[PDB]
Amino acid sequence: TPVTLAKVIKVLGRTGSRGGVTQVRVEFLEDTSRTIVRNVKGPVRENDILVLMESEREARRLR
Amino acid sequence: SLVVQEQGSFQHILRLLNTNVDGNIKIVYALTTIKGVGRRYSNLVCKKADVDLHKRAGELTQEELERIVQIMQNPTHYKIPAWFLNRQNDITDGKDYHTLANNVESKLRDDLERLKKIRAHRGIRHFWGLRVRGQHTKTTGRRRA
Amino acid sequence: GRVRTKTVKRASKALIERYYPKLTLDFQTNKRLCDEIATIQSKRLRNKIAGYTTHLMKRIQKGPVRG
Amino acid sequence: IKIRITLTSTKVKQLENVSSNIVKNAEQHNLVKKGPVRLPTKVLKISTRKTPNGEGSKTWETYEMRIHKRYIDLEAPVQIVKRITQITIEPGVDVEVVVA
Amino acid sequence: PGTIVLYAERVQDRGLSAVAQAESMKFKLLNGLAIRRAAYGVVRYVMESGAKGCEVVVSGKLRAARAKAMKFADGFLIHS
Amino acid sequence: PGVSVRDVAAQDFINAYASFLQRQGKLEVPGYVDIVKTSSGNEMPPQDAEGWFYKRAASVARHIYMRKQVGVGKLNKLYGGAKSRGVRPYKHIDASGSINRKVLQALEKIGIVEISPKGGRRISENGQRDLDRIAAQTLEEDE
Amino acid sequence: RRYGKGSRQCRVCSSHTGLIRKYGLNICRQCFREKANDIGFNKFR
Amino acid sequence: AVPSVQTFGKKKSATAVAHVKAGKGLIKVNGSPITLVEPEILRFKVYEPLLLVGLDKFSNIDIRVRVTGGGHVSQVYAIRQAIAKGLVAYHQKYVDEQSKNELKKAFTSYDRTLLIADSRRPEPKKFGGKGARSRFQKSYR
Amino acid sequence: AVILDQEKYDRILKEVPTYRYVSVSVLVDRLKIGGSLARIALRHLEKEGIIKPISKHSKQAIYTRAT
Amino acid sequence: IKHTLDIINVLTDQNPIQVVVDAITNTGPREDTTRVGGGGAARRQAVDVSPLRRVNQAIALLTIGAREAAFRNIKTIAETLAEELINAAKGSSTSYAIKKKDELERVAKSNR
RNA sequence: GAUGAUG
RNA sequence: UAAUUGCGAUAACGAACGAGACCUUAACCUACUAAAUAGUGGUGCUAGCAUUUGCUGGUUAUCCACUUCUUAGAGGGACUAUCGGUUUCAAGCCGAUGGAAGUUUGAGGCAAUAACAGGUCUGUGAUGCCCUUAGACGUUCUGGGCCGCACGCGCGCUACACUGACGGAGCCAGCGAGUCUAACCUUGGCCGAGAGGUCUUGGUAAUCUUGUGAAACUCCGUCGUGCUGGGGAUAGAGCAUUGUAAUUAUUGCUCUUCAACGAGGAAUUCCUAGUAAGCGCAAGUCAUCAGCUUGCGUUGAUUACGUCCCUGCCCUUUGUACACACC
């Protein structure tokens, strides 16, 4: 299956009962000007590149 | 150093002192199956017998084995120092001996039975099966039997 | 954290209200002035006092500081 | 006349009054001397449980007594050596003078 | 004999030695003076002598079977 | 250019000198070379039973060349190891005093060492000649 | 008698256990803490 | 006298002293060539200050090092600091400023420790454990 | 196998030159000679010039095919 | 690692470092799962994996498999690691690293 | 918004 | 903000203890004052290899100089200084340059009020009251025991092996201690397989033991996935050391005997960098005996830079039939 790439443009906060899940907003490389918010599992900064296995799943917040 | 081919006369076991010894183990460590033949008794005997230690135990010719065994049985005769043997100043004889094969256990049963008939503390403990070298028995050696 | 205690806040304030014309923005200069204008018991506390006095001096250049 | 005057005290302040006295006194008599040689400080540590009875969390305590030693060498006439050994007696400082 | 000699000297600032004051109170208590009278006696003298603070605590069987401490102080002491 | 013992790796020199002495054959060997083990810390006697004594002599020869003096004690320290002690933990244990004494007495009878003021042994003018001569050969064999 | 726990006692309280012998103090650990300041052992680090 | 310079480097307790003077290109550590330094695997740590700036600079000089303290690994790091420091101090006193600056720029851009010591030092033990921070095991029944 | 017959000695020389990389272990899983006998095999094949060394070390011997 | 880099060049006639890099970039799992629950009852939920952690978990898998494959084996450590790095960079399901990656990403897809 | 009695 | 640390707000105003300051120690100084009981260079004498003025040592009875490394006394240095972002823009916070050093620079010492019916009368010639006080619970002598073993638990030490065991070589620390109403730490020589024995010697110590030539570690070899050269329990026999005396083996050495243990169930401990962990040394006890404790150094990662889910802590608001206070 295809895989799409996106670029973190902001880090919103932290979630999970124990803080191991940061929340980010991203900008897709191809077809930019589409942004999605989703959760990540390890340390992360601005300008990082994330490989998204499925593009269209916007992620919920525990608070 | 190079590889050398060998004949098909290899024997895979050999009987010494009524025990069978594997032939696929280096010569020094092969004899260790014989009770009494410990690690440093094989090393010294095998070099008094002037055998090439690098060969396997099944690589030896018939004469070499009997050469080795003869040394093993009367070690002092070939100048194995007294302090290499397992029995010295025998309690009944005053002589020195090295004990091999079945003699090791038989002598052992004779050692305890001595203390038992004398009824010494050591002999008492052995008959009871407990630890005899001053250890604590409160927390140790529970499931020994 | 680099918060400064009341001993530092007030000793620095007490020097500006008496020695504005003689104080400068230089830490090295202010540091030597505070030897002749005060009796302090340690190099560490003296350095901190002179440091915060310098900090307030920059503030006054921008305008009046409260209090 | 070679002499070696040594000093041992547990507190530096008193010991620098004595040492500074010795060197400044010798230079006004223009004697020849070594400098005040300062040997490594040797510290004494005692470790001990605070508790006097064995109960409670295992809390250990350490103490320290410090010893500062110094010596100077003098080559001076005996008459001046006599009064030198006599002056600069101070509590808490110990002095020994050896000839040759 | 003849090498060790003992000298005496009257202690300077009699009212600012903890040994002197504590010993003063011990004899007062053995004679039958009250605990409250004694403790404030020590405090008042020390403060008159120029001290910046005093504190005296007496713990034991002051009044009944149970043991308790009791504190007296003046001025401002430091602890750390 | 000249050459000194310090200009050649330790591993090469020790084998080179040990061989030279083995060919030369006048070093005295104490006879118990088949029974003794080199320390109480060990459990098996040397594996190279033929040449272990010659190797030890070479090591001591270089060891003196570097430094002023040594004694049988200093060599026991240096050739100790970790005793097993079984269930209990390890501990440094000193080496065989007999072996190290009879390699220093042997080295004197060959003229490589001498007793020195201030105790212990020391290199001799003849000792330095032999070791230095063999170092230059070992370099030559770098081809 | 020439040796052992019975040959040594705290010079202050006659106690037999806990005695410290370093530097020839020979004072039991309890009494040492009491007398430490006078002997000259202070608490620094 | 011939030009000379004395410098030093440290790591943990190891320390090495490098005497440097105008010469023919000798580089000996502990009275032996630099080629025989042990442990073997780390020989290129000692060679690094030479290679990084070319062997040319070292032709007109003699360098003699000596090491003490620490252990097998920490000593090697002391040697490499002494050699780099000696070259910079020599160019300070006997060549010119520019050469010292450009040298320093190469050494720093690769590895800072070649010139500035490592500030780390060990922590004391604290009673109640086998280490500075570790503790003995606790049990409740 | 601890010692080798002719049927094995010839077996070595006829298959070992095809191995991309050979070592003490490679000669023990392709053909079943022991660990000890693999080491003498390596040194013999080195002298005879059938295999090259890339590096030599006490614990890890690396060889490759001759060129 | 001096021995292992050497074995890679012989076995593949390719730059050995580049093989190590490829092994890293083919093992870092892209999607993982996190425990999530309320009051004590819990379940899994899918999340994305960050760049740095992709490298971290890559290295751990490559060296854990190489360590476990050599234990109680005739092969040396430099060899088992050499085989592990060669297979993973090829994308071969024989490697411990690759198989584990797919186990993590399969679970993640089922817990979206 | 799963479970959690007693001294 | 680490902090009842500050900015402020304000029916409160001015104060005191605690935190911070303070002290100890670890990092830097080619700058002051010095120093063979610490060092380095040069020069007298000298051994070896080459010999052009070279390379490495010896000589602490040669003497001269010097202070980079080592020691201390007195001082310098850091204050988040400077610069850029950020909050009414105040306290602060994030990042970068420079620097030995920028998580209050790292680690400690000290450390309030008020409490526990916490531990201790077996540290004390510190103590009230009860008991005992000569056929004694006083004091002391001989001999036992506190070590006894069907089982249950808590600190630990060895391991279950090729990232290894064994053999020969390589070769490096820091913190310490050492002789009076006297035998301590021991170089060196010689005998002995070993433990150890004997004759001498220095050190009442930056002087000598002691570069405490320590272990893990590197290199070159032997063995080859075999409860095997992994493992060394449990046993037999002999030689030694300390002690009046070792039997219930005090401990050390030598040969032999060669068990469980194949990575460990429910559970559960410790830890954020010279830290965890691997490795050993000195000191405390000590005639002898460390698998323990207090410090010390050598080798040196992985993983967060967060959260309030489990266990708890501090502050505010709120309900209570609790006050021995949710047991």
PDB file of N, CA, C and O in Angstrom, chain H residues 105-135:
ATOM      1  N   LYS H 105      41.698  26.094  14.982  1.00  0.00           N
ATOM      2  CA  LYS H 105      40.423  25.929  14.301  1.00  0.00           C
ATOM      3  C   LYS H 105      40.244  24.503  13.808  1.00  0.00           C
ATOM      4  O   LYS H 105      39.140  23.956  13.862  1.00  0.00           O
ATOM      5  N   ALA H 106      41.310  23.886  13.314  1.00  0.00           N
ATOM      6  CA  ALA H 106      41.208  22.508  12.862  1.00  0.00           C
ATOM      7  C   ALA H 106      40.985  21.566  14.035  1.00  0.00           C
ATOM      8  O   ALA H 106      40.119  20.686  13.978  1.00  0.00           O
ATOM      9  N   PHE H 107      41.768  21.719  15.104  1.00  0.00           N
ATOM     10  CA  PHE H 107      41.634  20.817  16.243  1.00  0.00           C
ATOM     11  C   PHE H 107      40.245  20.896  16.854  1.00  0.00           C
ATOM     12  O   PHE H 107      39.662  19.871  17.219  1.00  0.00           O
ATOM     13  N   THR H 108      39.703  22.102  16.993  1.00  0.00           N
ATOM     14  CA  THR H 108      38.407  22.237  17.642  1.00  0.00           C
ATOM     15  C   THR H 108      37.292  21.701  16.761  1.00  0.00           C
ATOM     16  O   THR H 108      36.350  21.077  17.258  1.00  0.00           O
ATOM     17  N   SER H 109      37.375  21.921  15.453  1.00  0.00           N
ATOM     18  CA  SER H 109      36.268  21.545  14.592  1.00  0.00           C
ATOM     19  C   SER H 109      36.078  20.040  14.537  1.00  0.00           C
ATOM     20  O   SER H 109      34.993  19.578  14.173  1.00  0.00           O
ATOM     21  N   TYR H 110      37.100  19.268  14.882  1.00  0.00           N
ATOM     22  CA  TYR H 110      36.987  17.819  14.918  1.00  0.00           C
ATOM     23  C   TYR H 110      36.590  17.307  16.295  1.00  0.00           C
ATOM     24  O   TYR H 110      35.631  16.542  16.418  1.00  0.00           O
ATOM     25  N   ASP H 111      37.312  17.707  17.337  1.00  0.00           N
ATOM     26  CA  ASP H 111      37.052  17.185  18.675  1.00  0.00           C
ATOM     27  C   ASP H 111      37.562  18.187  19.693  1.00  0.00           C
ATOM     28  O   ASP H 111      38.754  18.491  19.720  1.00  0.00           O
ATOM     29  N   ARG H 112      36.657  18.685  20.534  1.00  0.00           N
ATOM     30  CA  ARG H 112      37.006  19.734  21.483  1.00  0.00           C
ATOM     31  C   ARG H 112      38.029  19.252  22.493  1.00  0.00           C
ATOM     32  O   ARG H 112      38.917  20.007  22.898  1.00  0.00           O
ATOM     33  N   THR H 113      37.918  18.000  22.918  1.00  0.00           N
ATOM     34  CA  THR H 113      38.761  17.486  23.983  1.00  0.00           C
ATOM     35  C   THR H 113      40.237  17.488  23.618  1.00  0.00           C
ATOM     36  O   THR H 113      41.075  17.349  24.513  1.00  0.00           O
ATOM     37  N   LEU H 114      40.583  17.651  22.339  1.00  0.00           N
ATOM     38  CA  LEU H 114      41.990  17.728  21.970  1.00  0.00           C
ATOM     39  C   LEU H 114      42.691  18.872  22.683  1.00  0.00           C
ATOM     40  O   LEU H 114      43.899  18.800  22.924  1.00  0.00           O
ATOM     41  N   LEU H 115      41.964  19.928  23.029  1.00  0.00           N
ATOM     42  CA  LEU H 115      42.561  21.091  23.664  1.00  0.00           C
ATOM     43  C   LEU H 115      41.966  21.436  25.024  1.00  0.00           C
ATOM     44  O   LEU H 115      42.708  21.884  25.898  1.00  0.00           O
ATOM     45  N   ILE H 116      40.670  21.230  25.239  1.00  0.00           N
ATOM     46  CA  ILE H 116      40.007  21.576  26.494  1.00  0.00           C
ATOM     47  C   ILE H 116      39.656  20.293  27.230  1.00  0.00           C
ATOM     48  O   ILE H 116      39.053  19.385  26.653  1.00  0.00           O
ATOM     49  N   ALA H 117      40.013  20.230  28.504  1.00  0.00           N
ATOM     50  CA  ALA H 117      39.856  19.003  29.259  1.00  0.00           C
ATOM     51  C   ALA H 117      38.383  18.701  29.497  1.00  0.00           C
ATOM     52  O   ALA H 117      37.513  19.566  29.376  1.00  0.00           O
ATOM     53  N   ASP H 118      38.109  17.446  29.835  1.00  0.00           N
ATOM     54  CA  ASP H 118      36.755  17.019  30.146  1.00  0.00           C
ATOM     55  C   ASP H 118      36.458  17.340  31.599  1.00  0.00           C
ATOM     56  O   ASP H 118      37.199  16.931  32.495  1.00  0.00           O
ATOM     57  N   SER H 119      35.375  18.070  31.834  1.00  0.00           N
ATOM     58  CA  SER H 119      35.082  18.585  33.161  1.00  0.00           C
ATOM     59  C   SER H 119      34.425  17.563  34.070  1.00  0.00           C
ATOM     60  O   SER H 119      34.237  17.846  35.256  1.00  0.00           O
ATOM     61  N   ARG H 120      34.066  16.396  33.551  1.00  0.00           N
ATOM     62  CA  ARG H 120      33.401  15.394  34.365  1.00  0.00           C
ATOM     63  C   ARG H 120      34.344  14.876  35.433  1.00  0.00           C
ATOM     64  O   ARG H 120      35.538  14.708  35.193  1.00  0.00           O
ATOM     65  N   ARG H 121      33.810  14.627  36.616  1.00  0.00           N
ATOM     66  CA  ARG H 121      34.550  13.968  37.678  1.00  0.00           C
ATOM     67  C   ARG H 121      33.599  13.037  38.407  1.00  0.00           C
ATOM     68  O   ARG H 121      32.377  13.185  38.305  1.00  0.00           O
ATOM     69  N   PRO H 122      34.122  12.068  39.145  1.00  0.00           N
ATOM     70  CA  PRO H 122      33.248  11.104  39.811  1.00  0.00           C
ATOM     71  C   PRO H 122      32.526  11.690  41.009  1.00  0.00           C
ATOM     72  O   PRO H 122      33.015  12.598  41.681  1.00  0.00           O
ATOM     73  N   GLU H 123      31.352  11.137  41.280  1.00  0.00           N
ATOM     74  CA  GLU H 123      30.490  11.437  42.412  1.00  0.00           C
ATOM     75  C   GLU H 123      30.890  10.601  43.619  1.00  0.00           C
ATOM     76  O   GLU H 123      31.278   9.443  43.468  1.00  0.00           O
ATOM     77  N   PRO H 124      30.812  11.148  44.821  1.00  0.00           N
ATOM     78  CA  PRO H 124      31.019  10.332  46.013  1.00  0.00           C
ATOM     79  C   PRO H 124      29.910   9.320  46.232  1.00  0.00           C
ATOM     80  O   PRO H 124      28.783   9.467  45.762  1.00  0.00           O
ATOM     81  N   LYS H 125      30.263   8.268  46.958  1.00  0.00           N
ATOM     82  CA  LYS H 125      29.293   7.315  47.468  1.00  0.00           C
ATOM     83  C   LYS H 125      28.532   7.929  48.632  1.00  0.00           C
ATOM     84  O   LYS H 125      29.023   8.827  49.317  1.00  0.00           O
ATOM     85  N   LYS H 126      27.322   7.439  48.855  1.00  0.00           N
ATOM     86  CA  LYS H 126      26.510   7.834  49.993  1.00  0.00           C
ATOM     87  C   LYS H 126      26.121   6.588  50.764  1.00  0.00           C
ATOM     88  O   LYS H 126      25.775   5.570  50.166  1.00  0.00           O
ATOM     89  N   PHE H 127      26.207   6.650  52.084  1.00  0.00           N
ATOM     90  CA  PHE H 127      25.876   5.480  52.875  1.00  0.00           C
ATOM     91  C   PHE H 127      24.462   5.034  52.559  1.00  0.00           C
ATOM     92  O   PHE H 127      23.585   5.845  52.254  1.00  0.00           O
ATOM     93  N   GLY H 128      24.242   3.733  52.625  1.00  0.00           N
ATOM     94  CA  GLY H 128      22.955   3.170  52.319  1.00  0.00           C
ATOM     95  C   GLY H 128      22.853   2.560  50.950  1.00  0.00           C
ATOM     96  O   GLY H 128      21.757   2.157  50.553  1.00  0.00           O
ATOM     97  N   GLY H 129      23.951   2.471  50.222  1.00  0.00           N
ATOM     98  CA  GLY H 129      23.925   1.898  48.893  1.00  0.00           C
ATOM     99  C   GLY H 129      25.331   1.584  48.453  1.00  0.00           C
ATOM    100  O   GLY H 129      26.305   1.884  49.146  1.00  0.00           O
ATOM    101  N   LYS H 130      25.422   0.962  47.293  1.00  0.00           N
ATOM    102  CA  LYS H 130      26.700   0.580  46.728  1.00  0.00           C
ATOM    103  C   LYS H 130      27.248   1.634  45.779  1.00  0.00           C
ATOM    104  O   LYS H 130      28.299   1.419  45.175  1.00  0.00           O
ATOM    105  N   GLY H 131      26.586   2.777  45.648  1.00  0.00           N
ATOM    106  CA  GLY H 131      27.041   3.794  44.724  1.00  0.00           C
ATOM    107  C   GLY H 131      26.469   5.149  45.074  1.00  0.00           C
ATOM    108  O   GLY H 131      25.764   5.315  46.070  1.00  0.00           O
ATOM    109  N   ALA H 132      26.779   6.127  44.227  1.00  0.00           N
ATOM    110  CA  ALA H 132      26.395   7.500  44.518  1.00  0.00           C
ATOM    111  C   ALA H 132      24.886   7.632  44.609  1.00  0.00           C
ATOM    112  O   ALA H 132      24.368   8.344  45.473  1.00  0.00           O
ATOM    113  N   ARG H 133      24.166   6.954  43.729  1.00  0.00           N
ATOM    114  CA  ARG H 133      22.724   7.074  43.642  1.00  0.00           C
ATOM    115  C   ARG H 133      22.000   5.772  43.913  1.00  0.00           C
ATOM    116  O   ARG H 133      20.893   5.799  44.449  1.00  0.00           O
ATOM    117  N   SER H 134      22.595   4.641  43.573  1.00  0.00           N
ATOM    118  CA  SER H 134      21.969   3.358  43.813  1.00  0.00           C
ATOM    119  C   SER H 134      21.797   3.126  45.303  1.00  0.00           C
ATOM    120  O   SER H 134      22.491   3.711  46.132  1.00  0.00           O
ATOM    121  N   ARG H 135      20.853   2.255  45.643  1.00  0.00           N
ATOM    122  CA  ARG H 135      20.547   1.946  47.027  1.00  0.00           C
ATOM    123  C   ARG H 135      20.507   0.441  47.234  1.00  0.00           C
ATOM    124  O   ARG H 135      20.413  -0.337  46.287  1.00  0.00           O
TER     125      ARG H 135
END
